[PDB]
């Protein structure tokens, strides 16, 4: 029988910074500094800057050299990661309870005192090429990247990975500039697990009071639409079809999330038929053999993309995309049962609860919530918010997809992949 | 400036190799002795008294 | 229910000091390993999956 | 299919202390090295001579 | 400030029970709204013969495709519709089926597992459909150099024994295995006393015990007379298997010496040593400054694309070593360095590196058991292997006991002047000769 489960504590300082901690009474500690500094904040003169940054978390700082960050962290068994999204960067650190201080100090040094010495950043440049090659080993990453480049005129159109032409080109000054114009107090959230509030709070007031950057959503993603096609003779065709949907935090975003589980988004049973996935089952009808399909759902600060993703043999991409699109048209046209929305509601709900089961999924959830919404929203009210989605909302979301201007990306042998106008 | 090799780890390193360095001397002594037939040293080993008196 | 990354779908790259470079958001594939012939390299100009800093005795 | 491999039978090349599955080989590990090393020791002793 | 030490005591005790069946029922309550449950059986390719090898793997396919009470796709829809997740896996000594599910769905989750574990239909048409799926997974697997190389490593290390075989079996067994072969393997193995019903989350032990009694009573209402469920020890062989293929862009290599087995306490020190050596991947930040000499030299001299140490444990035996991936002209250097590090630890380990290795194990231990699934898997399989749970704190004391001496002695024992098992796949012309590898296992200055 576990002890008293503490409540998360949350604090906004007058400078905009947010601190959120949960005393886990757990053997280890996890701490993250979340920043509104992702890819969407680059512009056309500095593309890739934030990729190189993601890769420079162990370069020398005032206060700690590269060698020290690496040995000091590894002497205690700890770790230091940086996770990027088009909206944000998350510097996360973990270690046992007794070592949070040194890890905290390493964290502070990396995020508020990097030196970007000219020779250390030069030695790092070729990592951009290796890091990108590894990620692009999955066709999915190229597709989702082309997907966003087609969907937007700017901001969200930027890729997570540095454009080749920029490799070797990003400069120390650009890194100094990106940190100082984006790693500021009002764009940050300091989240801690297995640490006390007063300790995090003290750290924030002491070391995270910096501001002199930008404040807005200094862009506002302009959804635009269009398609990008990469021919390559991979064996399967990967394709994604999308329309503008809802911004994170709007009630409509919740309709999209449920539409996503009606249609289907990930398998539940090892080697199963996916009986309750309406999308899969609808492609399965007229298509015989290798293929995958799933709803795709991405919601951001000021926009969102929703649709589907198909993997199929080159010759039947058309059949697969068209059968899938037809399946969404069928639910926009009103053919949806309450028991389906209800079941889709249970996978969303169960899935969310499952995603915050571990401390790393909780840390991320709390951190993203802190940046996106400025608050913590507990499991019962998220559930309650999902519950308020009506069948009609789900139908409306589907309707918005069917009639909205689209974006498509596809890679493979495209000889049989429809353009948008052919859909 | 040889103070680069002065610290706890180096002292533990020195220790772990003492038996080895000791045993290498054993080998070297016995080996020098036996190759020159060290009259002095050998006269004391029970057998190997192939020098009568 | 924020956390775009895990709200499933958008892409989320991770870099590490000790652990390993990840690209792990959402798209289909799992049910492509089911109806099959989803090759994969093993370890072509690469890296490594599942990664480490976990164990037991 | 790489699972159709199978290492071929070495029974007629094996030292007798091994040869039997069911039995671990760690138990004859010292003896088998003992014998092969003794051979070299003796050799070098002879060459020393 | 709760200290780390203190927090280890805060981890609630794992509760264990037994039905009259012999079925052990174990849980770790935590107050999450979600949980993981499933059954752990010790059955796996090591229990199979030449003839039925790949049997369990075949059952795992069939496992979720219809019971008697829920035929065809009825299972899927019950699970999918509650939002739960249904998984399974099989190694050479273990098999598992588990459900991730909303905590208040424990009752059905459990009802489902029993049904799977007991009333598996094995409808003749299904097995035929699966024949081609598995074959396909085989072609699929042949392209993962890493999977192929450990399969080779097992095949040569345990050359004339059951542990030599892979889990999926050879293609011909997949072709000829019949329903009767499956039902017999099932009856032979899916028997109460070799099964553990495990759970972790917002449950309570009594509920799980009640459910175990409700849906699982009636498995060993029989129990066999002279059957023969015993496991014979597996001969380890110092050998090499080289699959030369210059058409592949990088070489895979896996070396190992004989490990002691799940039960041996020596495993704690071995893992500490393995942590010191670490792993490496070309996407790691900071290379030249990495603690591990192997890791840092590999990063500075580009000897590697990746490498990792390992300690596979089986009953009374195991594989202890490292696997690496590299360019055709670096295999020789990678081996030289890998082997220098084992030797160095055998005879020369210092104190601060052991501390780093120790801490690395503490973080790994704890980082791993995070969330219901990993904890469940740990309860389930620990009972299979150790017989008990082994609470964090006991592991902590084992780790604490390790110092330089222990590393030196424990390493020496398994590594020093020991015949390794070598498996290699790819552009391996430069892979050192076996005699040469064998000579790297001892030091002439020692």
For E409, nearest residue in chain B (alpha carbons): B16
Q: Return all residues near E217 (Cβ < 8 A) that are at least 6 apart.
A: E19, E20, E21
Please give the full DSSP string across E173-220, using - where no structure is assigned: HHHH--HHHHHHHHHHH--GGGEEEEEEES--HHHHHHHHHHHH-SSS
Instruction: Please tell me whether residues A176 and A227 are part of one structural domain.
Output: no
Please give the full DSSP string across E137-155, using - where no structure is assigned: HHHHHTT-HHHHHHHHHHH
From the candidate CATH numbers 3.40.50.300, 3.40.50.10800, 3.30.565.10, 1.20.5.270, the one assigned to the domain spanning D1-49: 1.20.5.270
Distance of alpha carbon E431 from alpha carbon E425, whole angstroms = 10
Query: Given an 8 Å threshold on Cβ–Cβ distance, is E348 in contact with B13?
Result: yes
Using CB atoms, pick whichever of E7, E100, E290 lies closest to residue A70. E290
Instruction: Mark which residues 334-363 of E lie under 8 Å from C by CB.
Output: 360-361, 363
Q: How far is A6 from chain E (nearest CA, A)?
A: 12
For E292, nearest residue in chain C (alpha carbons): C18
CATH number of the domain at B17, please. 1.20.5.220
Neighbours of E376 (CB within 10 A): 27
- The tokens describing E28, both together, are 């770790």
- The tokens describing B28, both together, are 């070297």
| Residue A41 and residue A213 in contact, taking contact as beta carbons nearer than 8 Å | no
Query: Given an 8 Å threshold on Cβ–Cβ distance, is A75 in contact with E291?
Result: yes
Beta-carbon pairs below 8 A across chains C and E: 97
Q: Return all residues near E281 (Cβ < 8 A) that are at least 6 apart.
A: C20, C21, C47, C48, C51, E305, E306
User: Residue A355: which H helix or E strand, with range?
Assistant: helix A338-355
Beta-carbon pairs below 8 A across chains A and E: 162
Query: Which subunits count as partners of chain C given 3+ CB pairs below 8 Å?
Result: A, E
Residue E368 buriedness (CB in 10 A; 0-12 / 13-18 / 19+)? middle
Residue with tokens 């939002």: E83
Residues in chain E closer than 8 A to C51 (CB atoms): 279, 281
What is E14-227's CATH superfamily?
Metalloenzyme, LuxS/M16 peptidase-like (3.30.830.10)
Long-range contact pairs involving E78-81 (C-beta distance under 8 Å, separation at least 24): E78/E108, E78/E112, E79/A268, E79/A269, E79/E112, E80/A268, E80/A269, E80/A272, E80/A274, E80/A275, E80/A276, E80/A277, E80/A343, E80/A347, E81/A276, E81/A343, E81/A346
Residues in chain C closer than 8 A to E282 (CB atoms): 46-47
Instruction: Please tell me whether residues A165 and A228 are part of one structural domain.
Output: no
- The tokens describing A146, both together, are 């082309």
| Residue E317 and residue E164 in contact, taking contact as beta carbons nearer than 8 Å | no
What total number of domains does chain A contain? 2
Distance of alpha carbon E370 from alpha carbon A26, whole angstroms = 10
Q: Which DSSP state fits A152?
A: B
For E271, nearest residue in chain C (alpha carbons): C57
Residue E63 buriedness (CB in 10 A; 0-12 / 13-18 / 19+)? buried
Residues in chain A closer than 8 A to C45 (CB atoms): 133
Query: Given an 8 Å threshold on Cβ–Cβ distance, is C26 in contact with A266?
Result: yes
Domain annotation covers residue A336 = yes
Range of the domain at A419: 223-423
| Chain E interface mutation, best of A357, A361, A384, highest count of E Cβ atoms under 10 Å | A357
In angstroms, how far is CA A286 from the centroid of its own chain? 34
Using CB atoms, pick whichever of E156, E166, E317 lies closest to residue D3. E166
Expt. technique: X-ray
- The tokens describing A29, both together, are 């500690």
Q: Where are the domains of chain D?
A: 1-49
Report the candidate in E128, E130, E152 with the shortest Cα–Cα distance to residue E141: E152
Backbone phi, then psi, for B29, in 5-degree steps? -65, -60
For the structural domain made of E239-442, what CATH number should be given? Answer: 3.30.830.10
Distance of alpha carbon E34 from alpha carbon E15, whole angstroms = 18
Please give the full DSSP string across chain C, using - where no structure is assigned: ---TTTTSSS--EEEESSS--EE----S-HHHHSSS-----SSSSS--SS-SS----
Q: How far is E160 from chain D (nearest CA, A)?
A: 6
Number of H helices, E strands in chain E: 17, 12
| Residue A276 and residue A261 in contact, taking contact as beta carbons nearer than 8 Å | no
Residue ending a domain, among A211, A234, A268, is A211
Q: How far is E252 from chain C (nearest CA, A)?
A: 8
E300 touching A (Cβ < 8 Å)? no
C17 touching E (Cβ < 8 Å)? yes
| Residue E262 and residue E92 in contact, taking contact as beta carbons nearer than 8 Å | no
| Residue E310 and residue E157 in contact, taking contact as beta carbons nearer than 8 Å | no
| Residue E304 and residue C45 in contact, taking contact as beta carbons nearer than 8 Å | no
Query: Given an 8 Å threshold on Cβ–Cβ distance, is D1 in contact with E172?
Result: no
CATH number of the domain at C23, please. 2.10.210.10
| Chain D interface mutation, best of E235, E420, E434, highest count of D Cβ atoms under 10 Å | E235
Q: How far is A276 from chain E (nearest CA, A)?
A: 6
- The tokens describing E236, both together, are 């380890």
Distance of alpha carbon A48 from alpha carbon E258, whole angstroms = 48
- With DSSP H G I counted as helix, E B as strand and the rest as coil, what are the percentages for chain B, rounded to 5? 70, 0, 30
Instruction: Please tell me whether residues A302 and A423 are part of one structural domain.
Output: yes
- Are C and B touching by the rule of 3+ CB pairs within 8 Å? no
Distance of alpha carbon A311 from alpha carbon A237, whole angstroms = 6
Query: Given an 8 Å threshold on Cβ–Cβ distance, is E350 in contact with B12?
Result: yes
Neighbours of B8 (CB within 10 A): 10
Query: Given an 8 Å threshold on Cβ–Cβ distance, is E348 in contact with B20?
Result: no
Instruction: Please tell me whether residues A194 and A248 are part of one structural domain.
Output: no
Query: Given an 8 Å threshold on Cβ–Cβ distance, is E82 in contact with A379?
Result: no
Query: Given an 8 Å threshold on Cβ–Cβ distance, is C23 in contact with A138?
Result: yes
Report the candidate in E141, E211, E195, E181 with the shortest Cα–Cα distance to residue E24: E195
Neighbours of E76 (CB within 10 A): 23
| Residue A49 and residue A175 in contact, taking contact as beta carbons nearer than 8 Å | yes
Backbone φ/ψ region at E267: left (φ over 0), alpha (ψ -120 to 50), beta: alpha
Report the candidate in A398, A412, A218, A250 with the shortest Cα–Cα distance to residue A324: A398
Neighbours of A123 (CB within 10 A): 13
Report the candidate in E423, E7, E395 with the shortest Cα–Cα distance to residue E243: E423
Distance of alpha carbon A69 from alpha carbon A57, whole angstroms = 9
Backbone φ/ψ region at A34: left (φ over 0), alpha (ψ -120 to 50), beta: beta
Distance of alpha carbon A301 from alpha carbon A87, whole angstroms = 8
What total number of domains does chain C contain? 1
Distance of alpha carbon A158 from alpha carbon A50, whole angstroms = 11
Distance of alpha carbon E118 from alpha carbon E192, whole angstroms = 11
Give the CA-trace dihedral at A206, A208, A212, A214, to 10 degrees: -160
Using CB atoms, pick whichever of E144, E267, E378 lies closest to residue C42. E144
Range of the domain at C50: 1-57
Query: Given an 8 Å threshold on Cβ–Cβ distance, is E146 in contact with C47?
Result: no
Query: Which subunits count as partners of chain D given 3+ CB pairs below 8 Å?
Result: E
For E317, nearest residue in chain D (alpha carbons): D24
**C-alpha pair distances (Å), A380 with each of A111, C1, E35:** 34, 11, 17
Q: What is the CA radius of gyration of chain E?
A: 23
| Residue A199 and residue A172 in contact, taking contact as beta carbons nearer than 8 Å | no
- The tokens describing E39, both together, are 């059954």
Q: How far is D49 from chain E (nearest CA, A)?
A: 22
Distance of alpha carbon D16 from alpha carbon D32, whole angstroms = 10
- The catalytic residues of E are 60
**C-alpha pair distances (Å), E298 with each of E194, E295, E306, E431:** 44, 5, 9, 17
Q: Return all residues near E365 (Cβ < 8 A) that are at least 6 apart.
A: C55, C56, E392, E395
> In the beta sheet, which residues pair with residue E313?
E318
- The tokens describing A27, both together, are 């053997």
Give the CA-trace dihedral at A238, A285, C30, E164, to 10 degrees: -120
| Residue E108 and residue E147 in contact, taking contact as beta carbons nearer than 8 Å | no
| Residue A63 and residue A74 in contact, taking contact as beta carbons nearer than 8 Å | no
Distance of alpha carbon A238 from alpha carbon C34, whole angstroms = 16
| Residue E292 and residue E277 in contact, taking contact as beta carbons nearer than 8 Å | yes
3-state secondary structure of A116: coil
| Chain E interface mutation, best of C15, C18, C29, highest count of E Cβ atoms under 10 Å | C18
| Residue A86 and residue A305 in contact, taking contact as beta carbons nearer than 8 Å | no
Instruction: Mark which residues 237-296 of E lie under 8 Å from A by CB.
Output: 282-283, 285-286, 289-291
Distance of alpha carbon A258 from alpha carbon A391, whole angstroms = 9
Please give the full DSSP string across E246-291, using - where no structure is assigned: TTSSSEEEEEEEEE--TT-THHHHHHHHHHHH-EEETTBS-STT-S
E263 touching C (Cβ < 8 Å)? no
Range of the domain at B43: 1-53
CATH number of the domain at A343, please. 3.30.830.10
Query: Given an 8 Å threshold on Cβ–Cβ distance, is E4 in contact with A27?
Result: yes
B13 touching E (Cβ < 8 Å)? yes
Query: Given an 8 Å threshold on Cβ–Cβ distance, is D3 in contact with E236?
Result: no
């Amino acid at each position: 029988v576990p002890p008293h489960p503490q409540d998360l504590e949350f604090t906004r300082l007058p400078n905009g910074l947010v601190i959120a901690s949960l005393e886990n009474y757990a053997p280890a500690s996890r701490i993250g500094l979340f920043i509104k500094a992702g890819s969407r904040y680059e512009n056309s003169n500095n593309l890739g800057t934030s990729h190189l940054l993601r890769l420079a978390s162990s370069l020398t700082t005032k206060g700690a050299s590269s060698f020290k960050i690496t040995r000091g962290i590894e002497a205690v068994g700890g770790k230091l990661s940086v996770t990027s999204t088009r909206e944000n960067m998350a510097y996360t650190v973990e270690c046992l309870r007794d070592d949070v201080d040194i890890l905290m100090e390493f964290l502070l040094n990396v995020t508020t005192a990097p030196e970007f010495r000219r020779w250390e950043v030069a030695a790092l440049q070729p990592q951009l090429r290796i890091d990108k090659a590894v990620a692009l080993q999955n066709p999915q990453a190229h597709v989702i990247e082309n997907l966003h480049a087609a969907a937007y005129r700017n901001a969200l159109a930027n890729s997570l990975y540095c454009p080749d032409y920029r490799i070797g080109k990003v400069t120390p000054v650009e890194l100094h500039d990106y940190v100082q114009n984006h790693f500021t107090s009002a764009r940050m959230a300091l989240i801690g697990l297995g640490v006390s509030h007063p300790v995090l709070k003290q750290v924030a007031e002491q070391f995270l009071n910096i501001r002199g950057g930008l404040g807005l959503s200094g862009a506002k993603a302009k959804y635009h639409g269009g398609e990008i096609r990469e021919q390559n003779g991979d064996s399967l065709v990967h394709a994604a079809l999308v329309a503008e949907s809802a911004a994170i935090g709007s009630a409509e975003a919740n309709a999209f999330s449920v539409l996503q589980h009606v249609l289907g988004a990930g398998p539940h049973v090892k080697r199963g038929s996916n009986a309750t996935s309406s999308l899969y089952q609808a492609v399965a009808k007229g298509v015989h053999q290798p293929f995958d399909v799933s709803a795709f759902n991405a919601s951001y600060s000021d926009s969102g993309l929703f649709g589907f993703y198909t993997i199929s043999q080159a010759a039947s991409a058309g059949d697969v995309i068209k059968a899938a699109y037809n399946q969404v048209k069928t639910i926009a046209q009103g053919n949806l049962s309450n028991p389906d929305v209800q079941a889709a509601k249970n996978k969303l709900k169960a899935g969310y609860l499952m995603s915050v089961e571990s401390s790393e999924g909780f840390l991320d959830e709390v951190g993203s919530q802190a940046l996106a919404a400025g608050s913590y929203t507990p499991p019962s009210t998220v559930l309650q918010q999902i519950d308020a989605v009506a069948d009609a909302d789900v139908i409306n979301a589907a309707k918005k997809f069917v009639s909205g201007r689209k974006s498509m990306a596809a890679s493979g042998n495209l000889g049989h992949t429809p353009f948008i106008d052919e859909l | 400036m040889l103070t680069r090799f002065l610290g706890p780890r180096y002292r533990q390193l020195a220790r772990n190799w003492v038996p080895t360095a000791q045993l290498w001397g054993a080998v070297g002594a016995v080996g020098l002795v036996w190759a020159t037939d060290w009259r002095l040293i050998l006269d004391w080993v029970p057998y190997i008294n192939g020098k009568f008196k | 229910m924020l956390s775009v990354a895990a709200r499933s779908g958008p892409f989320a790259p991770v870099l590490s000091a000790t652990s390993r470079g990840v690209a792990g958001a959402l798209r289909p594939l799992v049910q492509a390993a089911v109806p099959a012939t989803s090759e994969s390299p093993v370890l072509d100009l690469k890296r490594s999956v599942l990664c480490r800093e976990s164990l037991r005795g | 299919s790489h699972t159709d491999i199978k290492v071929p039978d070495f029974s007629d090349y094996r030292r007798p202390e091994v040869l039997d599955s069911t039995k671990s080989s760690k138990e004859s590990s010292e003896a088998r090295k003992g014998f092969s090393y003794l051979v070299t020791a003796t050799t070098t002793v002879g060459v020393a001579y | 400030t709760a200290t780390y030490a203190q927090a280890l005591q805060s981890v609630p005790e794992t509760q264990v029970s037994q039905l009259d069946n012999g079925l052990r029922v174990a849980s770790e309550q935590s107050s999450q709204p979600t949980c993981t449950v499933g059954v752990w059986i010790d059955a796996g390719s090591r229990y199979e013969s030449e003839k039925n090898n790949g049997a369990g793997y075949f059952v795992e396919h069939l496992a979720f495709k219809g019971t008697k009470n829920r035929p065809g796709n009825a299972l899927e829809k019950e699970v999918e519709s509650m939002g739960a997740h249904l998984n399974a896996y099989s190694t050479r000594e273990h098999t598992a089926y588990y459900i991730k599910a909303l905590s208040k769905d424990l009752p059905k989750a459990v009802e489902l597992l029993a049904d799977i574990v007991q009333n598996c239909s094995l409808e003749d048409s299904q097995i035929e459909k699966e024949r081609d799926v598995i074959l396909q997974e085989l072609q699929e697997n042949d392209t993962s150099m890493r999977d192929v190389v450990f399969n080779y490593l097992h095949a040569t290390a345990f050359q004339g024994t059951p542990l030599a075989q892979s889990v999926e079996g050879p293609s011909e067994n997949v072709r000829k295995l019949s329903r009767a072969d499956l039902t017999e393997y099932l009856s032979r193995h899916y028997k109460a006393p070799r099964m553990v019903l495990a759970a972790a989350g917002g449950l309570e032990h009594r509920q799980l015990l009640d459910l175990a009694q409700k849906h699982f009573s009636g498995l060993s209402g029989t129990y066999d007379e002279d059957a023969v469920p015993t496991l014979s020890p597996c001969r380890f062989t110092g050998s090499q298997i080289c699959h030369r293929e210059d058409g592949l862009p990088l070489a895979h290599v896996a070396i190992a010496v004989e490990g002691p087995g799940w039960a041996h306490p020596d495993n704690v020190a071995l893992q500490v040593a393995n942590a010191i050596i670490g792993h490496y991947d070309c996407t790691y930040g900071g290379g030249a400054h990495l603690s591990s000499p192997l890791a840092s030299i590999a990063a500075t001299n580009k000897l590697c694309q990746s490498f990792q140490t390992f300690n596979i444990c089986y009953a009374d035996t195991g594989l202890l070593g490292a696997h690496f991936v590299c360019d055709h002209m670096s295999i020789d250097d990678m081996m030289f360095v890998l082997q220098g590090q084992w030797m160095r630890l055998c005879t020369s380990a210092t104190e601060s590196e052991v501390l780093r290795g120790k801490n690395l194990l503490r973080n790994a231990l704890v980082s791993h058991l995070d969330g219901t699934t990993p904890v469940c898997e740990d309860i389930g399989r620990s009972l299979l292997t150790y017989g008990r749970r082994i609470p964090l704190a006991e592991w902590e004391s084992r780790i604490a006991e390790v110092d330089a001496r222990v590393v030196r002695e424990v390493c020496s024992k398994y590594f020093y002047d020991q015949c390794p098992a070598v498996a290699g796949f790819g552009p391996i012309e430069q892979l050192p000769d076996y005699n040469r590898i064998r000579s790297g296992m001892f030091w002439l200055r020692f």
